Amino acid sequence: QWALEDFEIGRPLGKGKFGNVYLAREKQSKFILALKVLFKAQLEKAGVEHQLRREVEIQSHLRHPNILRLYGYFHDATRVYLILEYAPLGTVYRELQKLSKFDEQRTATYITELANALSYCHSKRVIHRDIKPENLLLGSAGELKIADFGWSVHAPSSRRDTLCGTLDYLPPEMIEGRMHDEKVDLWSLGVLCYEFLVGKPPFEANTYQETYKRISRVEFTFPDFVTEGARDLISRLLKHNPSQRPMLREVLEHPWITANSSK
C-alpha cells in the first residue's frame, strides 16, 4: 500500500471544506501527482464514509483521457488520502475568468471532450456527474478532465460567487426534488456550453429564488453574438422534459460542433 511517507508535498492546489489538494510526488520516481486530503472528522459528520468508500471504487476503475484518474488511496487515522492525476493547467474556471468568454472552436472541442467522457461513464453505469467550470481541469497540453468526485476544492480567486454558483448547473428535475437519470448531464452540458460562450451561465440571478424560477421555467436568452447552430445545440440541450434531451450521440453529431470542433 501507500502512506503519506512516500510523498513530498508542494503548494496546496486548492482548499476545500473537508480538505485540500496539494501538489505532490512519489519520493522514488519523483513522478508528480495531486494529493487530495480529507479530515474524516469533518467527513462522517456529513454522513459520508461508506458511500465515499465505494465512490472511490468507481473513479478508481474509470479510465479515460478526459477524466482525471485516481491512481490509489489510503487513510491514516485522522485523514483520508486520494492519490490523483495532476492537471498542470488547473481549472477551466480560472481560464474563463482570464479570457472572459471562450470562442467556438474551444467550446465545441471542450464540449466534444466532455461528451466523450460522460458517454464512457454512462457505459460504466455512472451519471449525476457534477461538472461546472471549477470541477474541470486542464491536462498536459490542451485537454479537459472531469475531476468531480472529491468534494469540490477552490484555489483563491474571485470572491463574487462563493456559493450561489450552485444552482445554475442543476436541472429542473434535481432542484424540484424529483428523481433523475442519465439525462441530467445533458442539461449540464447545455449549461456549460452557454457559459463558455457567454461568460455567464444561462440562469444567473441575484437570488436563489429568481435563479430557481428561470431554471424550472427554462427562461433564458442569448446575447447578440451567438450563432444559430450554437443556439440550436444548447436549445436542444436545455429542455424541461428530460426525454426531449439527446443522448450524447446526437450531441457529438451536431452540425455546429463538427463545424468548430478541433476533435
Ligand X SMILES: N#Cc1ccccc1Nc1ccnc(Nc2ccc(C(=O)O)cc2)n1
Q: Which three cell numbers stand for residue 154?
A: 477552490
226 contributes a contact to ligand X by CB under 6 A = no
38, 67, 87, 251: residue in contact with ligand X (rule CB under 6 A): 87
Burial of residue 236 (CB within 10 Å: 0-12, 13-18, 19+) is: middle
**Residue 250: CB minimum distance to ligand X, A:** 28
In the shown chain, the binding pattern of residues 16 to 55 toward ligand X, with x for contact by CB under 6 A and - for none, equals: -----x------------x---------------------
Under a CB-based contact definition with an 8 Å cutoff, are residues 94 and 155 in contact?
Answer: yes
Measured distance CA(118)–CA(146) in Å, rounded: 9
Query: 134-155: buried (b, 16+ CB within 10 Å) or exposed (e) per residue?
Result: bbbbbbeeebbbbbbbbebbbb
Residues 6+ apart with CB under 8 A from 94: 155, 157
Measured distance CA(201)–CA(194) in Å, rounded: 6
**Residue 99: CB minimum distance to ligand X, A:** 15
Q: Count residues binding ligand X (CB under 6 A).
A: 17
Percentages helix, strand, coil for the chain (3-state, rounded to 5) are 40, 15, 45
Question: In this chain, which residue has its C-beta nearest to ligand X?
Answer: 14
Q: Does 194 belong to an annotated binding site? A: no
Measured distance CA(139)–CA(135) in Å, rounded: 13
In the shown chain, the binding pattern of residues 127 to 166 toward ligand X, with x for contact by CB under 6 A and - for none, equals: -------xx-x---------x-----xxx-----------
* Residue number, 88 or 255, with CB nearest to ligand X: 88
Host H or E run for residue 21: strand 20-26
**Residue 219: CB minimum distance to ligand X, A:** 30
Active site residues: 130
Q: Does 241 belong to an annotated binding site? A: no
* Residue number, 110 or 256, with CB nearest to ligand X: 110
86 contributes a contact to ligand X by CB under 6 A = yes
Q: Does 17 belong to an annotated binding site? A: yes
Site residues, ligand X (CB under 6 A): 13-14, 21, 34, 84, 86-88, 90-91, 134-135, 137, 147, 153-155
